[PDB]
Design a binder for this molecule. Structure first.
Ligand SMILES: CCOC(=O)C1=C(C)NC(=O)N[C@H]1c1ccc(S(N)(=O)=O)cc1
Ligand SMILES: [Zn+2]
Length: 256
């Protein structure tokens, strides 16, 4: 699977039928149709920079992975009673500045999107166990709006020169990804899925109301990453965003 016309989102359903499920992500958030929910607690993140482990080129994207052997780095509050353990962050982007976000807000497409992914360590003993369970994953989505260079991205962008081609990986240490989040943690939440195969309907989405910035040149760095292995013909990673999917009558709740 990939993002090409042949192996891309519109074809995913052939091998992964859950693509046509009732809890697929991402979605268009219609602000007129959101339900303000008084029970929602503030989102609480507490990440230890010592849990940062590795940056990896996975061909369709790059990931920054965290040591997840204990509760040093955790998400709490919002719609959750359980504590969720940080394991990864990554981005999505588009071929142009005009699209690239996965979530949209009232039809508006942002240039990119940050995903900070966590697993339910109260109920489950590993990411592998948690990953397929309705209450297994919690992902914070931050919409990224093209404008001023974002200095908080600096360590991440500087690391890409070491993982230019598929499969390449490097230590990525001493980094707290709560530095990338907007200063307001007002959010939307809805029950949904991983936005690429295997598309498990295991994610509680936390979508920040406030966007963070990214420059056109910072976006060019993401797209200058190569999907091919070293020595092969260069194939830029131009985009990796899934189209919005039907709500099929789910409710997006607002903390605000
Ligand atoms: C069984 C593992 O479970 C997962 O969590 C992931 C899988 C299979 N694939 C990845 O490459 N990384 C993880 C992932 C996390 C968040 C999103 S997203 N984009 O935030 O929905 C996708 C994949
Ligand atoms: Zn993602």
């Amino acid at each position: 699977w990939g993002y090409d016309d042949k192996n891309g989102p519109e074809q995913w359903s052939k091998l992964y039928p859950i693509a046509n499920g009732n809890n697929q992500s991402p979605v268009d958030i219609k602000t007129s149709e959101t339900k303000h929910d008084t029970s929602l607690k503030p989102i609480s993140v507490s990440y230890n920079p010592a849990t940062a482990k590795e940056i990896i080129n996975v061909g369709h994207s790059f990931h920054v992975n965290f040591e997840d052997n204990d509760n040093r780095s955790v998400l709490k509050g919002g719609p959750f009673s359980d504590s969720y353990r940080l394991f990864q962050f990554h981005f999505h982007w588009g071929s142009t500045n005009e699209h690239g976000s996965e979530h949209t807000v009232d039809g508006v497409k942002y240039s990119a999107e940050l995903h900070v992914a966590h697993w339910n360590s109260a109920k489950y003993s590993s990411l592998a166990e948690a990953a397929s369970k309705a209450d297994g994953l919690a992902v914070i989505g931050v919409l990224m709006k093209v404008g001023e260079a974002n200095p908080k991205l600096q360590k991440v962008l500087d690391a890409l020169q070491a993982i230019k081609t598929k499969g390449k990986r490097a230590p990525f240490t001493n980094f707290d990804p709560s530095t990338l989040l907007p200063s307001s943690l007002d959010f939307w939440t809805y029950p949904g899925s991983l936005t690429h195969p295997p598309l498990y309907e295991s994610v509680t989405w936390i979508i920040c109301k406030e966007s963070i910035s990214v420059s056109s040149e910072q976006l060019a760095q993401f797209r200058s990453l190569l999907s091919n292995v070293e020595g092969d013909n260069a194939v830029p990673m131009q985009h990796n965003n899934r189209p919005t999917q039907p709500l099929k009558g789910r409710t997006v709740r607002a903390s605000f």
